[PDB]
Write a protein that binds this ligand. Structure first.
Ligand SMILES: [Co+2]
Ligand SMILES: [Co+2]
Ligand SMILES: [Co+2]
Ligand SMILES: [Co+2]
Ligand SMILES: [Co+2]
Ligand SMILES: [Co+2]
Ligand SMILES: [Co+2]
Ligand SMILES: [Co+2]
Lengths: 387, 387, 387, 387
């Protein structure tokens, strides 16, 4: 009953299931997990792949023999489980050397060290088999108005991203970059807060075909925006390379709950938008199990994310495959929305007398749009109570 | 004492001072104002120009003789006061024919009527002397997830904006377009909610040099974002053609208070950013006086906006012209932020041994950034208590 | 299929279905409705009763003959439909004489006029058969910090509510009062913003057994709080006399959507809390149909509110009547939450050695709470996918 | 220049200046501070006293000899500095045994252990000389709707607070209790989120004269409410026993910035309300220095909190002592707000013909309130630009 399979492209993170529960008012409630154990339990649950930070796989300040031993043990775990790695990311936020930032720091040697650590993790990501890179700007911001010059910081972020694009062009890899936006937490105001700010940063670079977005449901719900509107703008731009699925209960701190929890209707319209657009990337869950749970609660939340995605996929397919719903879609003129406005020309629009001169504004205004009947049909197909 | 002058480019709107106080739980508390009286009182207060909707100047469904009589009376008022018109906008939100939207509606004749009304107001705006056009997407959105298809709606908005750009290219005018973002109110989720979403829409058009943004302090503070960060990203893109100044007390409804009220520190850093960048456009106040006030309170709020801008301009100039502040700026390494990261090359960065191999992360992490001393100097220069 | 009946106590408002669609950026999209027509269509839909403002039933400044003609026509409509009136409220927000407030105004004659209008509407409410009175503080607040003295305003609100309690004690009626909280809109900061602020105001009055709360789902979701937590605190205090059900999509303006839309999981836990506590009052829907809809969309939204309540009542009863859910409730120690902490005494708690001295904090901390398995069971019972 | 003195009652916390900078995306950036060193540096800065958690002073699981050695060293530091202890609090949130909660937990032995730890810290607080106790409900809440029964949890919180009141009544101490509200972080929905919810909990207890509130500026600004409105309701109830002063930049995570930063106008009206009401308690700063700062930045922020309070005290006294401001206060009818509404009686109000019959609503509605001129006078007295 709603059993996940590796053909559904369900991927998880190592920091998701390996989170020890350290919130800033409490200590850790769970022990540290082996990545081999995490890969084997995610293979028993039915996932497709795992993602990793560099500090999640290899600990900080270790030797090259311990680095290649960790890479060999992780490669033996992936070869015995059959799982892939579709995405990797870097850690530029945990260490106190990155307390002002990574690529946009006030120290040039800290900026060069973050670039060198990023280039080493890109080499490890291509060596492990990833095809998407994610650069989350965690510490890139300020707590006051005079702590960062924002135009110079966008110049240094453009210089660092063009250096990474020049490095992958010179090595000839097939990896592509993704930018993960967030409005705040841990900084007061994180640079590029939204998907649109990330896309406007992407269209100013030198090689803009290698950069996309990695949006998050929770990170766009802390700004109070609409996540199907952001995903549909990113798909209209053709730049959605990766996605992150979690839950959020409104404008607050980053909770990172399981998928389906929080805004269930927005998750339903997100799953309906991805199934109607045909997004063929990985389905990544960047979530956190709560610190009141044990490891059985961790794997129960990891099963519940995939179960909620399969239930919402079945409800969205049953919503879109219905003749009464298609009659309500024809009654709400959404097929006339798909028609072009003026395909006859600008001179034909200026010479058409029925657009301004004989247009009846009262007869066009006394026409119901019937959106509430379609929304009640969507609510009945979501809850399963159809007559 | 802080007397405004027309060289300071202070502009207002007709709907700002002519607001009758109709909120959705109450009736109107003031009578309708004459635009001639509004232009003469704003000339006595010391403004530079006025802006207008088409429905603010000429009422709906009137004749051409009453239209040219209103244009002749407004032109006689501008010729006797000496004020200009730097900006005009259209009204696609008040009438019930635009209850689904203007350029992105589900009715093709409503879309063509909104385009024809926009072209007629562009002809009136060039005839009156404006050089910036503002298209605010007021009703462009939905209250449910299935009421709009967002990719087709962005296709129709791209088609309508390319038709307006083709019209001003064919007539050969010197006017430029501006897009005013808003997250919500009156719709549940308004398309292009932020400045970054507007810039990402601007970089997908066919002639992108004629389109910019018209951001608002309140409209970016209902999303919980940072308005100097948005204005600095719009100035880094080179697309800030117009601005709107008001106040807002957090994530709530659109209050549209006077300038200085609300986030005083964010208004101070906004005035400091505009004075350091040298923005030479109009200083427009899109504000609303409250409905508890009379007309003396309306002109007191209109004087208080310009007085708050001149006081914040003096405090920002006294903040930037100070040797102890410049010593704190050198101590916070913001001159090293202005230096480039790797101007020696990618191969020089990969061969530089001091970036990764002999980089001391503990000695680079045990260095204070001293942002709080600079923020206390900014607070002392804001409040005037300097020792 | 989920047909409503008058035994389910479903009540509506006259201003709900009679809303003409006047938002503050647009005009009215619908004509004015007859209250006789609204009562007859709500009787055909299956409601139990209607509520009214005084200005919704009798227009402002009319004669006593037109007042008794409107009362006679409304009484003939109620006698031919069989519907009741369980609740009435007053209008102290639409007229421009109440632009500073009603009971807490800066004018003593305006305060006395609001008290006299409230006493006349209480006499009409007892004459029509209501048993609950609602006093919504619409305009009771300020836009600046120096426009109201808040302690003197709470003194005048206490004086006005004690005068209304003295009036209903002197007339000997059986009506009870309810206070409806709201954080903002139309004022910047409305006095008594939450249910807890209303309860803390209720416990300072002279006759506190005649005052309760009338909370709203949307009005507590504009503050970002938890509405089952507020309803459970109001039921723990024993003061929940009335309720208002609508929808809201987060911290924004007051949308007043239909029930079920917005936070569906919070609506599910609200319906589960009311069905487990046994709240026997009216089920009132203070909602607004959108201005894109016609009258068929208005009655479709009015049917969809009752259909969503009956579907959530069936899902909450199927959630609570389940042995696997009861086993998860026993595993999550919520039966041990219902046990008292120290029923043996304070000296027995201080002399009990197993509370502090031999208490094993590691063995008590290494115990999973299993909340995620219970929340997945609640999500499966909400969506109907149970194996 | 604005030098603080111990007669101004400026108090700090040990966890404020001893915060190591551990946010949930990063590690610690500073070493652990000695409390003797913190008391001596706060005495050199000019504070009046220090507050403490029990885990801040004595570490967890230590012996009684190390406990009395820490108490003897802290007592020698207080005797050599001359500083007091006005307030103490307990730690029921850091350890993983309190991951579900303290007083409202699902485990009875965890509830009894939290009560015994609270009684031991009350004995240490009376032994050190404190007169106010603060019980912050950090972990008292849930992440889902079925994880806590809220009425049973309020019953157990009432039982635990009545047990603490019975303990201080039986020992005969002069200490009083304070409840610190917070909406969320670290839980999803913390029980008693606001000051009004805490006051409504206080008025249900058995001995309600020993319980008050300890509100925070940031904790009431994460709910989007008005903190002078909450402090004025707590002073109208007569229950403000303690206060916490910090800063917050809107509805987000708990930043805990320095005082004056964030909402400067709301901090100005808060300082004006405390100086006009005559609050004679301690002025406590529950703030966090940022992790980019060193120890000189920590003591610079600790000096800047007291400097911002003294500057706002001088500006509020200069605002209230002004004849033009008093003329605007008489013009805005705030002396008529202080007059009672109906001191002649209910029968005199019902027989007064000038309240309803000869009341001119148009002449009372065509009267300006002149709030914007008073708010401009308050802005000019805040910024110091007075003519
Ligand atoms: Co997240
Ligand atoms: Co993520
Ligand atoms: Co606005
Ligand atoms: Co504007
Ligand atoms: Co409402
Ligand atoms: Co209501
Ligand atoms: Co705090
Ligand atoms: Co605190």
């Amino acid at each position: 009953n709603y059993q996940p399979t590796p053909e559904d492209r369900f991927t998880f993170g190592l920091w998701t299931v390996g989170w020890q529960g350290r919130d800033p008012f409490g200590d850790a409630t769970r022990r540290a997990l082996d990545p081999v154990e995490s890969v084997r339990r995610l293979a028993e649950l039915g996932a497709h792949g795992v993602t990793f930070h560099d500090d999640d796989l290899i600990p900080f300040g270790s030797s090259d023999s311990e680095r290649e031993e960790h890479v060999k043990r992780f490669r033996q775990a992936l070869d015995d489980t059959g799982m892939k790695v579709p995405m990797a990311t870097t850690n530029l936020f945990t260490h106190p050397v990155f307390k002002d930032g990574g690529f946009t720091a006030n120290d040039r040697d800290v900026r060069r060290y973050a670039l060198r650590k990023t280039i080493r993790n890109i080499d490890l990501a291509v060596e492990l088999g990833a095809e998407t890179y994610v650069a989350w700007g965690g510490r890139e911001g300020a707590e006051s108005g005079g702590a960062k010059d924002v135009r110079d910081a966008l110049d240094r972020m453009k210089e660092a991203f063009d250096l990474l694009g020049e490095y992958v062009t010179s090595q000839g890899y097939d990896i592509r970059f993704a930018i993960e936006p967030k409005p705040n937490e841990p900084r007061g105001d994180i640079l590029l807060p939204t998907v649109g700010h990330a896309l406007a940063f992407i269209e100013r670079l030198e090689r803009p075909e290698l950069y996309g977005v990695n949006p998050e449901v929770g990170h766009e719900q802390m700004a109070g925006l609409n996540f199907p509107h952001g995903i549909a703008q990113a798909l209209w731009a053709g730049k959605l390379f990766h996605i992150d699925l979690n839950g959020q209960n409104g404008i607050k701190y980053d909770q990172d709950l399981r998928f389906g929890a929080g805004d269930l209707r927005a998750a339903f319209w997100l799953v309906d938008l991805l199934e109607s657009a045909g997004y063929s990337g990985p389905r990544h869950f960047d979530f956190k199990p709560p610190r009141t749970e044990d490891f059985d609660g961790v794997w129960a939340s990891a099963a519940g994310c995939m179960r909620n995605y399969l239930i919402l996929k079945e409800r969205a397919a049953a919503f879109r495959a219905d003749p009464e719903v298609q009659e309500a879609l024809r009654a709400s003129r959404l097929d006339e929305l798909a028609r072009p406005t003026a395909a006859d020309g600008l001179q034909a629009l200026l010479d058409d007398r029925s657009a301004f001169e004989e247009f009846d504004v009262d007869a066009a205004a006394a026409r119901g749009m019937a959106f509430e009947r379609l929304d009640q049909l969507a609510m009945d197909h979501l809850l399963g109570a159809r007559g």
